[PDB]
Design a protein around this ligand. Structure first.
Ligand code: HEM
Ligand SMILES: [Ca+2]
Length: 392
C-alpha cells in the first residue's frame, strides 16, 4: 500500500479499518512521496506500546537520511529542524511550562472567550449566511498564535506564515521545490524578525524564550518561530474547522451542551477523539533492533501511528464512529501519547472549549449547505475545509 491514503475530507480512508482488522500489529506501506518503506500502526493497543517506548525516537525520525512519509524534509535546508529538543536542550522546560501550561491558560482564557463570543455575536447580527472558516476560525486561531505564541503579527505576516505552513506540510498538490521553499521563506522571515517579535508587547511564548537565561542566538529564536508556526497554526485552524463541522452535524448534542454547560469539557475530549485532523501519521525510528507485539523492527526503520485510526479503533472505543460526549472509554490520541504529548494541549483545549461554548450558547446554528457539498483542501497535511457556509 502507498501512503498516505488521500482521505482529505472528514471521511477516514477505508484502508485504516482494512489494516486494523488484519492479523499484523504493524503493516508495511510505502511513502508515495519518497518511495521509502515504512511501518504503519492502526490499533490502539499497539500504538500505546510504540509511543510509550522511548527506544522508538521522534528525533531520529528526522535525521538526515531518515525514511519518511513526507515528500520533503519538514525543515529549512541547513537548519537543525528539531527545535523542541533544542529548546529543551538549552534548558527551557520551565519556560515552556510557564508559556504553555496552566499559568498561560489563566493569562489568556479571558480574552480567548471574549473573542470567540465577539466573533459569533457579529455573525449572529447578520442576515443570511456566513463562512465559519474565514469569519470565525481564522481570526480566533490567528489571535491564539499571535497573542500566545509569536507576538503581534501584521495581517500580511499572518498570511505568509499560515501559507508557508500549509504548503510546507502538504503531501501533494505542489512541487517539492515550492515545499522546501516554504520552509526557507519562514526561516528567513524569522531570521529577520524573530527578535523584533520577541520584543512586542504581551507574554507570548517567543518572548519568554528570548527573555530566559541559557543568550539564544538569532538562529535559535528563528527555529523556535518556525516550530510554533507549524505546530500551532495548521493544527488549530484545521481542528477548529473540523470540530465546528462535527458540532453542526450533531444538533442533539449541541442542545444537550446548551442545557448542561458542565458537560462541555467531556465534549471537548470527544471532539479530540472523533474529529480527524492529520492526513498522515506521527512517526518514530527504531534506535536499535526492537520487537513490537511480536514483530521485529530493525534499527533505522520508521514506524508511523495514524492517530485517526487509533481514535477510531473499535477494540478501544465501543461505537468508535459515533460522536458521544460523556463516553467513558480510554484516553484519546488526539494529542498523541507519551513524552511527545502535545505541549500545546492546554491552550488548544482552551480555544476548543471556547468554541464549543460559543456554539452551545446559540442553538440553531447550522450548515448552509449539505455536508457532502463542503469543499476540502486536497493534499494538506492537516485536513481543512475551504469554507464552512453557515447560518441561523
Ligand atoms: C497553540 C497550539 C499548539 C502548539 C503550540 C502545539 C505545539 C506542539 C509541539 C511543540 C509539539 C512537539 C512535541 C514533541 O515533539 O515533543 C506538538 C506535538 C503534537 N501536537 Fe500540538 N500544538 C498545538 C496545537 C495542537 C492541536 C490543536 C492538536 C490536535 C488537535 C495538536 C496535536 C499534536 C500532536 C498529536 C502531537 C504529537 C506529535 C508526535 O507524537 O510526534 N497540537 N505540539
Ligand atoms: Ca537507513
Amino acid at each position: 500500500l502507498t501512503y498516505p491514503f488521500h482521505d482529505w475530507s472528514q471521511e477516514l480512508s477505508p484502508r485504516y479499518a482494512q489494516l486494523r482488522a488484519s492479523d499484523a500489529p504493524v503493516c508495511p506501506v510505502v511513502s508515495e512521496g519518497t518511495g521509502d518503506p515504512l511501518w504503519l500502526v492502526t490499533r490502539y493497543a499497539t500504538a500505546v506500546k510504540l509511543l510509550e517506548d522511548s527506544r522508538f525516537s521522534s528525533e531520529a525520525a528526522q535525521a538526515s537520511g531518515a525514511p519518511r512519509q513526507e515528500p520533503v524534509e519538514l525543515r529549512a535546508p541547513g537548519t537543525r529542524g528539531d527545535a523542541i529538543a533544542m529548546l529543551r536542550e538549552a534548558g527551557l522546560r520551565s519556560v515552556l511550562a510557564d508559556g504553555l501550561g496552566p499559568r498561560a491558560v489563566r493569562r489568556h482564557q479571558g480574552w480567548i472567550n471574549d473573542l470567540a463570543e465577539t466573533l459569533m455575536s457579529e455573525l449572529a447580527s447578520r442576515e443570511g449566511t456566513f463562512d465559519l472558516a474565514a469569519d470565525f476560525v481564522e481570526p480566533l486561531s490567528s489571535a491564539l498564535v499571535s497573542r500566545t505564541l509569536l507576538g503581534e503579527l501584521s495581517a500580511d505576516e499572518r498570511d505568509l506564515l499560515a501559507h508557508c505552513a500549509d504548503t510546507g506540510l502538504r503531501f501533494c498538490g505542489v512541487t517539492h521545490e515550492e515545499q522546501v521553499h516554504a520552509f526557507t521563506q519562514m526561516h528567513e522571515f524569522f531570521l529577520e524578525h524573530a527578535r523584533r517579535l520577541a520584543g512586542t508587547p504581551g507574554e507570548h511564548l517567543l518572548k519568554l524564550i528570548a527573555e530566559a537565561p541559557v543568550p539564544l542566538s538569532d538562529e535559535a529564536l528563528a527555529e523556535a518561530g518556525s516550530l510554533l508556526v507549524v505546530a500551532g497554526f495548521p493544527t488549530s485552524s484545521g481542528f477548529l474547522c473540523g470540530a465546528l463541522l462535527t458540532l453542526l452535524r450533531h444538533p442533539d448534542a449541541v442542545q444537550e451542551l446548551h442545557a448542561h454547560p458542565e458537560r462541555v469539557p467531556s465534549a471537548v475530549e470527544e471532539l479530540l477523539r472523533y474529529t480527524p485532523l492529520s492526513t498522515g501519521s506521527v512517526k518514530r525510528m527504531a534506535t536499535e533492533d526492537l520487537e513490537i507485539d511480536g514483530v521485529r523492527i530493525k534499527a533505522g526503520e520508521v514506524v508511523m501511528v495514524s492517530l485517526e485510526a487509533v481514535n477510531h479503533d473499535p477494540d478501544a472505543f465501543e461505537d468508535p464512529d459515533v460522536f458521544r460526549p460523556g463516553r467513558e472509554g480510554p484516553m484519546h490520541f488526539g494529542f498523541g501519547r507519551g513524552r511527545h504529548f502535545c505541549p500545546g494541549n492546554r491552550l488548544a483545549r482552551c480555544v476548543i472549549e471556547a468554541t464549543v461554548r460559543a456554539v452551545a450558547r446559540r442553538p440553531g446554528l447550522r450548515l448552509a449547505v449539505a455536508p457532502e457539498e463542503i469543499s476540502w483542501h486536497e493534499g494538506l497535511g492537516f485536513r481543512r475545509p475551504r469554507a464552512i457556509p453557515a447560518t441561523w
